[PDB]
Every structure is written in structure tokens, then in C-alpha cells.
Design a binder for this molecule. Structure first.
Ligand code: IU2
Length: 164
């Protein structure tokens, strides 16, 4: 069902995460971590303190899809074992140095064709697929987008509700 999912998304904040490659999203799914550039790291840290749930919705550049969504379980922290991210050109490792812990809510894909009816007020009412890495998605649009994903029956949200 969708009741626990709706509970987790209640009064949540939502952020679009753009990845330049699939390898980093795969690593995030396996290890439950994400790192972003310092401008977005600061925004996510502020949001984590401000809201019951902060949701990252992932899209690999040029894939035409979202690859799933996850909830922050921590602010960013430094000094773990360096995550072996695949850096795009110009991207350095100190740039991606802060590591957030995340709990996946859905690891299934959603094609952009299925979200064409959803527009984001915080990005000029452009289709929600459109946005830079870190773009915030308004509550109603973000909730409806998350509800469009296929259900992920491998995930039990009971432990996530307890983190809240
Ligand atoms: C592990 N974190 C990341 N991994 C990768 Cl491959 N790309 C990222 C990441 N964070 C932001 N970007 C990004 C988004 C749009 C254009 C250029 C770079």
C-alpha cells in the first residue's frame, strides 16, 4: 500500500538531484550515501534541520528518467572512508567531500514521460523533470511525483518512520 509512504512524505521537503553518471547513483543505492557540491550541501543541511523529512529525487543526466528517491538521515559529515565516486570533468573529490546518510524509499525508475503533467512552482512552473542539481520542488508537486513511482516492495518504511 501507500499509507506509510504518504506519512513519510507529510510536510516533507523535496530536492532534485542530478547525477552526471549512473555509477554514482548505483553507489548511493548500495551504500546509502550521497555527496553534492558545496552550494547544495549547505542548502540540504539547512533543510535537514527544518523539516520532518528531506527527500532527494535522483535523475541521471541524459537518461530521461528518475532513478528513485531517498530520505536524508543525517547532515553532511567528513572523515569517513573516501567514497569512490566517479568524477566528471572539472569535478574534484574535495568538492564532493561532505557525505550525507540516506535511506532509500524507492529504488525503481520513473520515466520523464510519466511526470509531464507535474510542474514545479519553484522553477517557474516548468515540468518537474527540468531543474538544476539541488533545485527545490514544492511540497504538492514533490508529493505527487514521489507517488508516481512504481512501488518498491523490497523496502519497509517502518524503520524510516522511527527515524523521524
Ligand atoms: C556524488 N555526487 C555527484 N556525482 C556526479 Cl557523477 N555528478 C553530480 C554530483 N552532484 C552533483 N552533480 C552534478 C549535476 C549536474 C552537472 C554536473 C555535476
Amino acid at each position: 500500500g501507500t499509507s506509510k509512504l504518504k506519512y513519510v512524505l507529510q510536510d516533507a521537503r523535496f530536492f532534485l538531484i542530478k547525477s552526471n553518471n549512473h555509477e554514482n547513483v548505483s553507489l548511493a543505492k548500495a551504500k546509502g550515501v550521497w555527496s553534492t557540491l558545496p552550494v547544495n550541501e549547505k542548502k540540504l543541511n539547512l533543510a535537514f534541520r527544518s523539516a520532518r523529512s528531506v527527500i532527494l529525487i535522483f535523475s541521471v543526466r541524459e537518461s530521461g528518467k528518475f532513478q528513485g528517491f531517498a530520505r536524508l538521515s543525517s547532515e553532511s559529515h567528513h572523515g569517513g572512508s573516501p567514497i569512490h565516486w566517479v568524477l566528471p570533468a572539472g569535478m574534484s573529490a574535495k568538492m564532493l567531500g561532505g557525505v550525507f546518510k540516506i535511506d532509500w524509499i524507492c529504488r525503481r525508475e520513473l520515466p520523464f514521460t510519466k511526470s509531464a503533467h507535474l510542474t514545479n512552482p519553484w522553477n517557474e512552473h516548468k515540468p518537474v523533470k527540468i531543474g538544476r542539481d539541488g533545485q527545490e520542488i514544492e511540497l504538492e508537486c514533490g508529493t505527487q511525483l514521489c507517488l508516481l513511482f512504481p512501488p518498491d516492495e523490497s523496502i519497509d518504511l517502518y524503520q524510516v518512520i522511527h527515524k523521524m
